[PDB]
Structures are given as C-alpha cells and as structure tokens.
C-alpha cells in the first residue's frame, strides 16, 4: 500500500512517548502561541450578568519529541491523536459552564510539522460572567472580559503569547453578530499574571 | 530604593471595579504602571514589568503598590485611579475616579 509508510510513521512517533510529562519538563518553559477567531458573538443575558462567545480558539507549541522525517511536510490527524499525547490545559477564568462542540465528532484537529511544531484547534461555545455597573441603565456600557491561561502549569513551567500582535490576534467575523439589544464596539487584548494559591499563573485577556 | 504607595478609596466599595496606579513625569505625558481586577489578574507596563508590584485589599477597599530598584528617571507623580475598563485598561479616559496624586523623588 502506498500510504502505509505513514502508519509507520505515526507508529513511530508515539514509541516511548510519555503524554503525562510536558515539552521541557525541568528543562524550558512551554512556550504556547494563542489566538481566537470569534464566530459568532452571543446573546448577552444581563440577568444573569452573563454573555455567550462561540470561538475557533485555536493553539500551538513546539515538542521536540515529536519530530520525524516523512513525504509530505505536515501529517493532519484525527481528534483521538490529540488525547493519544500531551496539550496544554487551557481553561477561561471567568466561564460558567461551556461545551466542546462534537456534532458529527469532536470538532478539533492536530497539524504535525516536520520541525515539531503544533496545532491544536477547537471550537468552542464559552458563556462567561460579565460584572455590570447599572447605575447609567438604559444608558451603560460594559467591558465583558474573556480571560484563560494554563490551570496546572506556572508561570516557569508555561506560558502563553499571543501569535501576531496583540491588537491583530484576536478577530470577529463580520457576518457573526447575535446582539439584540447592544453593540459590539471592538475589543482590547492583553496579557497579565494572576497570583493564586498554588502560585503563579499567565492569564491572557480579551475584553 | 524600595519604597511602598497605598490609596485606599472612601465614599463607594470598588470591589467591583479595576484600580491601577498611573505615572507622570515632568512633560505632560500620562504613563501607565499596573493595574489589578476583581479577579486579582494583573496588568503591568513594558517599562516596569517585574519591578513595581500592585495589589489589592478588598476588604479595606485599597490598592498598593511596591515600588523595587528605583533608577533616577522614575522621579514623577503617582496618581491612583479606579473604574471599569472600558475601551481602556492601558487608557486614562476609561478611569472616572483619580486620586489627587504624590510627589515621589529619586536623588542618587
């Protein structure tokens, strides 16, 4: 068969990988290059001081260990390779209750460069608190944060970037607008640290 | 040298809102320092990432911040500002409240 090779491949790339450690265990920092593609832009719900996103929020990061030699420059796996190795944990801080959409199959993909290099897409549904001060109502304006970071990891163990600059990173479609009542403005990307109990954590911002 | 500036608000609970210091050296031009959440997230400029530390005291109501490795150039005004980002968190037009500001000096 001409494309058994690349079982091979793939035979060979998961021998004696171990998915519980992470890219640079006690020897670098995880770098993870982060960016969003906003679909569609929810109802906000100022009853429950709640607003809905549905995102393509898509990451990516070097493992050396992963790193091969074959035909073709880029090996697009299924969903289940991703659960077969290590990715990053990333969650939102001021979500609720989102969903992984898996309508027809988990709605994410991984891209494999020769060089070792990532892409872990996804498509999310993420309905996250946002505080109001109704003192201006019907005349207020709010900022709805959007913000996530590593859950496990530190600031020495990962830490997220943004892919191009920070203003040009984070898009919304044009057509994708569900707002009844308000008006999307624009946003403001930024970056900062959160300093929990367990210790010290990147959280990447989008209000 | 180390030094240590805390504001602490009256008249109105800013547990809700972001409150961050912001600089103004001799010249007219309002510099961002840091600034801190409800959800203890926080900000800081390029200029003093890693050498000012900012944190907040909810139940005092008050923000400080721990100024480390004071260079002669930091001699400026402080001021402290409180209220919600809006097309801002970097900006000064996005905060409504501001403290009426300290003089702090460096002299090698």
């Known amino acids: 068969d001409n494309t058994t090779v690349f079982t091979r491949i793939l035979d060979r790339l998961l021998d004696g990988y171990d998915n519980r450690l992470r890219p640079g265990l006690g020897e670098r920092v995880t770098e993870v290059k982060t960016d969003i593609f906003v679909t569609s832009f929810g109802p906000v719900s100022d009853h429950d001081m709640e607003y809905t996103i549905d995102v393509f929020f898509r990451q990516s990061w070097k493992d050396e260990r992963l790193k091969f030699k074959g035909p073709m420059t880029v090996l697009r796996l299924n969903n289940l390779m991703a659960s077969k190795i290590w990715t990053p944990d990333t969650f939102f801080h001021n979500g609720k209750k989102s969903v992984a959409h898996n309508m027809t199959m988990p709605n994410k993909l991984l891209r494999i460069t020769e060089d070792g290099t990532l892409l872990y897409t996804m498509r999310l549904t993420v309905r996250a608190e946002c505080p109001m001060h109704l003192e201006d109502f019907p005349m207020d304006a709010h900022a709805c944060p959007l913000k996530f970071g590593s859950y496990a990891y530190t600031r020495a163990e990962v830490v997220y970037e943004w892919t191009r600059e920070p203003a040009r990173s984070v898009v919304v479609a044009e057509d994708g607008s569900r707002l009844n009542q308000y008006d999307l403005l624009g946003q403001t990307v930024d970056s900062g640290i959160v300093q929990s109990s367990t210790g010290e954590y990147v959280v990447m911002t989008t209000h | 040298g180390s030094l240590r500036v805390s504001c602490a608000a009256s008249g109105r609970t800013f547990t809700t809102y972001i409150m961050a210091w912001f600089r103004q050296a001799p010249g007219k031009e309002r510099e961002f320092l840091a600034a801190?959440?409800?959800?203890?997230?926080?900000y800081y400029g390029d200029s003093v990432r890693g050498r000012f530390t900012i944190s907040r005291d909810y139940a005092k109501n008050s923000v400080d911040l721990q100024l480390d490795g004071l260079r002669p150039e930091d001699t400026a005004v402080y001021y402290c500002?409180?209220?919600?980002?809006?097309?801002?968190?970097?900006?000064?037009?996005?905060?409504?409240?501001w403290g009426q500001g300290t003089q702090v000096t460096v002299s090698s």
């Open positions: 500002a409180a209220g919600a980002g809006f097309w801002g968190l970097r900006t000064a037009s996005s905060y409504h409240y």
């Open positions: 801190m959440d409800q959800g203890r997230i926080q």
